[PDB]
């Protein structure tokens, strides 16, 4: 309940001119008070129009400002020019930074003046520096300066925080003021004209530095931030890698004194096992070399901190190491040229001097894995393999982006990259030939996208024609079905939907065991991803062809084999100025349907071969092998306790055996912990890097500034949970900057706290960190209803596309492939489903989003005169709130701390009620209807759509299922079985869990079925209304958990809900009309 | 390994408790039993599957 | 068991090589239990077999 005050103070700060006026708008559910609100708003508008002060009106309508709820603030300012520089000159007292132009290997990566890199405006490109975020550097400077003004007169540790941040911002502000604040355009891009005489990386460096300095609280924070901010001005390439390198060894220096053990996808059983860390001298030499590299780059504080920690190598002081690791990733992205990044990726030294025996065994293992994955569906004539083309057509929405093509629908021309629209266009023009896989050779080389992650090297992505996806979809789906129940495939293994996000490596860690872990992210152009890998897959397909008598399955396998054959001899396109390089590339890359599963298969085969060779010199049992995306790790158990020499010998043997196959591996062997891309374990504890950048983005998103503010808050929450706390006031300042909309060049509307924190499509953040927003008061229900009224919007582009003959022809072909002939009713439902699937196209979704935002803005400019009987979640909670009695309770701490970087209050919740055991899926995946849908298409209807559908008539449900692509017989079986009667409860559970973010943020870490938690909830059971009991119990759990989060203490809840109230609420529980913005989903794991 | 005839070792003094701390030293015995309990927990194997 | 012929050949080859190389030994082949042994992996035996 602080956002509105901070907003008003920020408006005063940024519009300190004497002509600046803030007009606060209010709303109320009470008609008597709403009339006063309307009169107050009218009088404020009239006074501003006549230019009269509004102070007296705050006395005339002091009840409105008291009893009504603030809806927004209208700001009128007329002196906006050169305001940020006027504020900044105060903080530019320090010495500006001078870039070292001999730090980066590539010339254009040195932070020199833009003219020195792009002599003419035609040569200029901001792609190598673009923050790719819809917020300006001027806004970041304004937010930092507002924070400094607000906290200028703090005392105690607050004053120390202010002083540290003032020093860091003095650095940043002096550097920026030396050249002047560059001005963004409407697209938040920085043009050549405003960047000629500035350092090229000034804007992105300034954004990263502002984030870092606003993330500083302690002295160690200040030292790390100062070092990184000063060094990243000159270093743009190797700084993050330099700082993150030691961690891969540090995890191996901490003994385990008790640890966690994964059971099923989030369930941990805890061990009191003690394991000593066995570290050979070579590892210490490597760590010494890493620290020497740090110092050679100008680092003094970070290596000194690491050396100080190395005195004891204790897990209690390891949080500083985790802090350095997380901070390393906030020096921004490395958006080097596609040519250099690709050439780094496809830098290969292929040799004929490889071990033929090893390669033949590896190929045989790949063949065996493919056969194991696809034997049963191939032998039994699985429907998906019989209708592979139809399955691919139905699942096109889940395909990767193609290369942009000029499509025409009706009389409109578009430039979609969506493969479904490409299929539509080709069908309309007689170019749809699934049976032919286009070559990807020097005649039609593959265009390349890029995936960039801070610290990590850039990855190339194939952009293939849609025929590859059509050919590969069904086979890869069968592969994923197999891999979901295979524990070795960490990326895919899951009992229902959730992955082993904590990993499974600590179960077999012992004093007779060692864990070998290897980074394999650089094995895209390795010699083992060449002909051997593709030919192993081809041999598997050839074997599978003999196991089936269905011509359609054989044709599916033939098309998959043809895709592999074509990809064996493939070329890639890379632009370079005015010349396109066609580079031979017969290796693996993402952007193909099978890439993830195929990489897992190949890595498993390769590690099996390597371990087979390593068994020559040592006797051990391989306990587990896990291939988790960019990393692999295997646990080897020995008949003796592990010694230093054993660890060193195993590491050397693994490296040499991988080299025998021409694979360059840095084989890291430990006894106590590992470090992989998505987590690292040290001292029996698990850590996740908190490197999500806030003021910089990898690439320009297809969202709005509103949704980007929501994503900014979500990223801030995820970073905070992982141990990287940015000041919440700075985040709220950014939120108010990004959610404001210009009614005119002089008038700007700032939404209030209620607007932004309310559960709706417009939700951006929560008033309290880690607590889902809900409220039982009349105003909150009223505004939720009003916002729900604005959710439904149309798209003109979607309408024109759906009305075009191209879309109608596509729907007709889809229907005839679905065994319907001029049905006239089924076809219309299929057309609706395909029009919905068109929502993945960025212009359509953006048009809908902007329509919603515009409607919201029109509503916000006036007091909300909207009333409806529509039921929202706040209505349910208001109904059930009065019957809950609250008492003070106590829970002892009886659960282990396994995530040391969790915030203290979240950690308290975990210690008191425990961590999540098993997760109820948020999409209703384990409902009969959802399983039926997944049987034919990977398209996932939103849980809201399923919630609406499951309460319709039987024929309506049947028609919806047929539209999704389920055959009529199966849909009629589902409906006539009356299975929807049981399915509606699972659907309601998933719907409510989605609305209340039970599977997001900190809630995903909690156990909502904890015996300790349910010991605090006392709801006498009344049967035969499961929906009401479910919502009552979930609400009680949320209330208790949120109270503990906010206060750090516990409350018991008691609700003797009357039966009549239960029956009344039962009717409403199936008519809930509520939404929550997906942009507010804070996924702790990513 | 075949240990040489000239190899030596020192036997630990594993005499049973002469102080009988289990009798009337209830707090000391509580500490001892707590240490034994922690060690046993550390060595008890973890359930799997 | 099904590699009977190959194992007979392997045993004969190993014995013949041992005898032929033993013809070249000039110092008494004294059999003693040495302090340290040569570790042999039974997986290597499986590979040979």
């Amino acid at each position: 309940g602080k956002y509105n005050l901070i907003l008003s103070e920020y408006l005063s700060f940024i519009y300190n001119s004497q002509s600046a006026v803030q007009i606060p708008i209010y709303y109320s559910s009470n008609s008597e008070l709403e009339n006063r609100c309307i009169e107050f708003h009218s009088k404020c508008l009239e006074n501003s129009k006549n230019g009269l002060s509004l102070k007296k009106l705050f006395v005339e309508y002091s009840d409105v400002i008291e009893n009504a709820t603030l809806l927004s603030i209208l700001s009128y300012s007329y002196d906006k020019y050169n305001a940020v520089e006027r504020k900044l000159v105060k903080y530019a007292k320090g010495k500006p930074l001078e870039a070292d132009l001999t730090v980066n290997e590539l010339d254009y990566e040195n932070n020199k003046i833009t003219s020195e890199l792009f002599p003419t405006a035609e040569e200029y490109t901001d792609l190598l520096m673009d923050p790719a975020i819809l917020t300006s550097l001027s806004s970041n400077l304004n937010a930092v300066m507002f924070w400094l003004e607000k906290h200028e007169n703090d005392v105690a540790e607050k004053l120390k925080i202010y002083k540290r941040r003032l020093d860091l911002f003095t650095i940043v502000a002096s550097t920026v003021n030396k050249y002047g604040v560059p001005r963004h355009n409407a697209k938040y891009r920085y043009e050549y004209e405003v960047m000629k005489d500035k350092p090229y990386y000034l804007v992105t460096w300034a954004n990263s530095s502002i984030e870092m300095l606003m993330s500083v609280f302690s002295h160690e924070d200040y030292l790390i931030a100062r070092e990184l901010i000063v060094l990243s001005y000159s270093n743009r390439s190797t700084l993050a890698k330099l700082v993150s390198s030691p961690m891969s060894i540090l995890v191996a220096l901490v003994d385990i004194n008790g640890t966690f053990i994964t059971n099923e996808e989030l369930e941990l059983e805890f061990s009191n096992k003690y394991v000593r860390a066995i570290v050979p001298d070579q590892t210490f030499d490597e760590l010494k070399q890493m620290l020497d590299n740090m110092r050679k780059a100008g680092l003094t504080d970070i290596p000194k901190m690491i050396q100080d920690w190395l005195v004891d190598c204790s897990i209690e002081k390891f949080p500083l190491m985790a802090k350095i690791y997380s901070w390393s990733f906030h020096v921004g992205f490395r958006k080097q040229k596609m040519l250099d990044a690709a050439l780094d990726q496809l830098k290969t030294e292929y040799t004929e001097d490889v071990d033929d025996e090893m390669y033949r065994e590896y190929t045989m293992l790949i063949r065996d894995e493919v056969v194991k994955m696809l034997e049963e569906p191939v032998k039994h004539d699985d429907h998906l393999l019989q209708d592979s083309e139809l399955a691919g057509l139905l699942s096109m929405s889940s395909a990767s982006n193609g290369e942009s093509r000029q499509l025409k629908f009706g009389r409109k021309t578009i430039f979609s990259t969506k493969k479904n629209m490409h299929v539509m266009d080709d069908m309309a023009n007689g170019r749809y030939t699934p049976g032919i896989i286009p070559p990807v050779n020097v005649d039609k080389p593959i265009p390349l996208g890029r995936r960039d992650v801070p610290g990590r090297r850039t990855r190339i992505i194939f952009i293939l024609p849609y025929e590859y996806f059509i050919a590969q979809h069904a086979v890869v789906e069968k592969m994923l079905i197999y891999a979901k129940h295979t524990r070795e495939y960490a990326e895919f293994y899951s009992q229902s939907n959730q992955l082993l996000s904590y990993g499974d490596v600590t179960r077999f860690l012992s004093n007779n065991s060692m864990v070998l872990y290897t980074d394999v992210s650089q094995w895209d152009s390795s010699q083992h991803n060449t002909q051997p890998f593709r030919k192993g897959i081809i041999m598997g397909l050839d074997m599978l062809a003999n196991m089936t008598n269905d011509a359609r399955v054989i044709q599916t396998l033939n098309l998959y084999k043809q895709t592999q054959i074509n990809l064996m001899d493939s070329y890639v396109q890379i632009p370079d100025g005015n010349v396109i390089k066609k580079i031979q590339y017969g290796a693996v890359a993402s952007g193909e349907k099978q890439t993830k599963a195929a990489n897992s298969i190949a890595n498993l085969a390769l590690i099996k071969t390597v371990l087979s060779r390593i068994s020559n010199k040592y006797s051990f049992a391989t306990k587990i092998i896990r291939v988790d995306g960019d990393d692999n790790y295997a646990v080897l158990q020995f008949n003796t306790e592990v010694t230093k020499q054993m660890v060193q010998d195993v590491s050397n043997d693994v490296r040499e055996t991988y080299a025998r196959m021409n694979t360059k591996v840095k084989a890291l062997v430990s006894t106590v912990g590992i470090e992989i891309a998505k987590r690292y374990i040290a001292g029996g504890k698990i850590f996740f890097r908190a490197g999500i950048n806030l003021l910089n983005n990898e690439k320009k998103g297809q969202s709005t500034q509103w949704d980007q503010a929501a994503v900014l808050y979500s990223n801030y929450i995820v970073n905070r949970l992982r141990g990287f706390e940015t000041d919440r006031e700075f985040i709220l300042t950014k939120i108010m900057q990004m959610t404001s909309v210009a009614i005119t060049g002089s008038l700007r509307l700032f939404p209030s706290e209620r607007v932004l924190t309310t559960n709706s499509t417009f939700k951006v953040f929560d008033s309290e960190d880690f607590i889902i927003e809900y409220g039982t008061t009349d105003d909150e229900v009223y505004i939720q209803r009003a916002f729900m009224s604005l959710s439904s919007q149309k798209s003109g582009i979607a309408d024109e596309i759906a009305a075009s003959s191209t879309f109608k022809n596509y729907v007709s072909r889809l229907s005839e492939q679905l065994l319907f002939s001029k049905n006239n009713i089924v076809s219309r439902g299929i057309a609706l489903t395909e029009k919905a699937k068109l929502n993945s196209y960025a212009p359509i979704s953006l048009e809908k989003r902007r329509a919603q935002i515009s409607a919201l803005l029109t509503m916000l400019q006036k007091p909300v005169t909207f009333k409806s009987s529509k039921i929202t979640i706040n209505d349910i909670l208001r109904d059930i709130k009065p019957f809950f009695t609250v008492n003070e309770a106590h829970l002892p701490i009886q659960y282990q701390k396994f995530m040391p970087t969790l915030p203290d209050n979240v950690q308290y919740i975990i210690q008191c009620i425990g961590s999540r055991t098993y997760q109820i899926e948020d999409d209703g995946s384990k409902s009969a209807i959802s399983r039926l849908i997944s049987k034919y298409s990977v398209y996932k209807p939103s849980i809201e759509e399923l919630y609406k559908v499951i309460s319709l008539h039987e024929n309506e449900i049947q028609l919806y299922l047929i539209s999704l692509g389920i055959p009529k017989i199966d849909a009629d079986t589902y409906v006539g079985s009356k299975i929807y009667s049981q399915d509606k409860y699972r659907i309601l559970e998933s719907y409510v869990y989605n609305l209340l973010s039970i599977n997001y943020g900190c809630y995903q870490l909690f156990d909502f079925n904890s015996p300790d938690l349910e010991k605090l909830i006392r709801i006498p059971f009344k049967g035969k209304i499961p929906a009401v009991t479910f919502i009552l119990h979930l609400y009680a759990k949320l209330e208790v958990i949120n109270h503990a989060i906010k206060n750090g203490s516990w409350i018991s809840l008691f609700c003797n809900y009357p039966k009549s109230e239960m029956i009344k609420l039962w009717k409403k529980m199936w008519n809930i009309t509520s939404l929550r913005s997906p942009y507010t989903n804070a996924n702790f794991f990513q | 390994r075949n240990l040489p005839s000239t190899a030596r070792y020192i036997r630990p003094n594993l005499l049973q408790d002469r102080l009988n701390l289990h009798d009337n030293f209830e707090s000391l015995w509580d500490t001892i039993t707590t240490s034994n309990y922690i060690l046993a927990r550390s060595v008890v194997p973890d359930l799997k599957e | 068991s099904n590699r009977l012929g190959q194992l007979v050949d392997l045993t004969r080859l190993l014995a013949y090589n041992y005898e032929t190389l033993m013809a070249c030994i000039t110092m008494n082949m004294q059999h003693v239990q040495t302090l340290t042994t040569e570790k042999l992996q039974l997986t290597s035996v499986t590979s040979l077999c």
Binding site: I278, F284, D285, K288, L291, L310, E641 | - | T36
Partner: peptide, 28 residues
């Protein structure tokens, strides 16, 4: 300055908490 890192490295190699049993070296 580098001598501090030298001492740190030597201590780490001879550190009590990272060493394993040494009987085989005694025999050898």
């Amino acid at each position: 300055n580098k001598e501090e890192s030298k001492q740190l490295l030597e201590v780490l190699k001879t550190k009590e908490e990272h060493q394993k049993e040494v009987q085989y070296e005694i025999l050898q």
